[PDB]
Design an enzyme around this catalytic site. Structure first.
Site, short mmCIF file in Angstrom:
data_model
loop_
_atom_site.label_atom_id
_atom_site.label_comp_id
_atom_site.label_asym_id
_atom_site.label_seq_id
_atom_site.Cartn_x
_atom_site.Cartn_y
_atom_site.Cartn_z
N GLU A 1 0.98 -1.23 0.55
CA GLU A 1 0.04 -0.27 -0.04
C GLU A 1 0.63 1.50 -0.25
O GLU A 1 -0.06 1.70 0.52
CB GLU A 1 -1.07 0.70 1.33
CG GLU A 1 -2.01 -1.33 1.01
CD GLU A 1 -2.89 -0.82 1.97
OE1 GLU A 1 -2.61 -0.67 3.10
OE2 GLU A 1 -3.12 -2.67 2.54
N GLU B 1 -5.86 -11.49 -0.57
CA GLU B 1 -6.35 -10.84 0.08
C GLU B 1 -8.31 -11.12 -0.25
O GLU B 1 -8.57 -10.18 0.82
CB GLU B 1 -6.23 -9.73 1.29
CG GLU B 1 -4.82 -9.59 1.21
CD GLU B 1 -4.60 -8.62 2.25
OE1 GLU B 1 -5.06 -8.24 2.40
OE2 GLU B 1 -2.87 -7.51 1.93
#
EC number: 3.2.1.8
Length: 331
Positions: free
Chosen positions: A133, A240
């Site tokens: 991220e 995920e």
């Protein structure tokens, strides 16, 4: 194991099927896990704070247990994020007076951390989420403003990948991120990895987190993200995956089970998604769910504290949901 077929076995010739796990689940759901998944990821026990709480002390107990569990059963292991702005202890970014660490300190500390963590499981982890991220969600912002970027420098991603590659030249190095299908963020992540590749950084894959829901992103949007990323000649991992029954900042809080609407949409939704994954199995080599069954999910506390969610194909009692049957692979 019982009745239902093995989810992972159904995709044995397409891509791995994994699940995020925690040691607490092993001596209880271990049988179920080994049955349906041929890949696992430490949901939290491999993160910086979890394995390196203090500068001179490493605590690999939990991670070691997960790895022993997987490797002894022929189950692969993805290493989860080495460099991330969250779950990274304060000591890492501070000097002795509590002030900010210098660029040199950041570099030597990052090197030792990666060498210790990546080296520890050398040859055992097929893929590492090296940087997690780094891209902003804000339209007019590219690089997320983090301590890594400020204290280490703009070359922190290149550094991380070089170090990881050196600790284990056989592991696939990934850049992992969420909202990866959003047109605007997609192009930012695309340009980031592209620039990394052009700089010589050893990035071998892009991790599409897949924190989606029953209303989006669309098949078209997912399709475009896939082809876009794959065009960089890197492997793609859905890392995920979960299908929340709720939307962004959802105001609903009384549900104790999904509505008939939510259940019907989720089932169809999962069928669509895996249909798309099979179509692009040449680009996608591993698909991991961010959990095992509805009895536990990080979504039960995020973004809303204490709001139960039911994002998987297996229910709260580990029984297959309608979605499971519509997701079975072709092998």
């Amino acid at each position: 194991s019982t009745e239902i077929p093995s989810l992972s076995a159904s995709y044995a010739n397409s891509f791995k099927i994994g699940a995020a796990v925690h040691t607490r689940m092993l001596q209880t759901e271990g049988e179920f896990i080994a049955k349906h998944y041929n890949s696992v990821t430490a949901e939290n026990q491999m993160k910086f704070e979890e394995v390196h709480p203090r500068e001179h002390e490493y605590t690999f107990e939990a991670a070691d247990e997960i790895v022993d569990f997987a490797v002894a059963r022929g189950i692969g292991v993805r290493g989860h994020t080495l460099v991330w702005h969250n779950q990274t202890p304060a000591w890492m970014f501070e000097d002795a007076s509590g002030g900010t660490a210098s660029r040199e300190m950041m570099l030597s500390r990052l090197k030792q951390h990666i060498d210790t963590v990546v080296g520890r499981y050398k040859d055992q982890i097929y893929a590492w989420d090296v940087v997690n991220e780094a891209i902003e969600d804000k339209t007019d912002l590219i690089m997320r403003d983090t301590k890594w970027l400020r204290l280490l420098g703009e070359d922190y991603l290149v550094q991380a990948f070089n170090m990881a590659h050196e600790a284990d030249p056989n592991a696939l190095l990934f850049y992992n991120d969420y909202n990866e299908t959003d047109p605007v963020k997609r192009e930012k992540i695309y340009n980031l990895v592209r620039s990394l590749l052009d700089q010589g950084a050893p990035v071998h894959g892009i991790g599409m987190q897949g924190h989606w829901n029953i209303h989006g992103p669309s098949m078209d949007e997912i399709r475009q993200a896939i082809e876009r990323y794959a065009s960089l000649d890197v492997q793609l991992h859905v890392t995920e995956l979960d299908l929340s029954v709720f939307r962004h900042e959802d105001q609903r809080t009384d549900l104790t089970e999904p509505t008939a609407e939510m259940a019907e949409l989720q089932q169809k939704r999962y069928e669509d998604i895996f249909g798309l994954f099979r179509e692009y199995r040449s680009n996608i080599t591993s698909v991991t769910f961010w959990g095992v069954a509805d009895n536990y999910t990080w979504l039960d506390n995020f973004p809303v504290r204490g709001r139960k969610n039911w994002p998987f194909v297996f229910d709260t009692e580990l029984q297959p949901k309608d979605s499971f049957w519509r997701i079975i692979g072709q092998d």
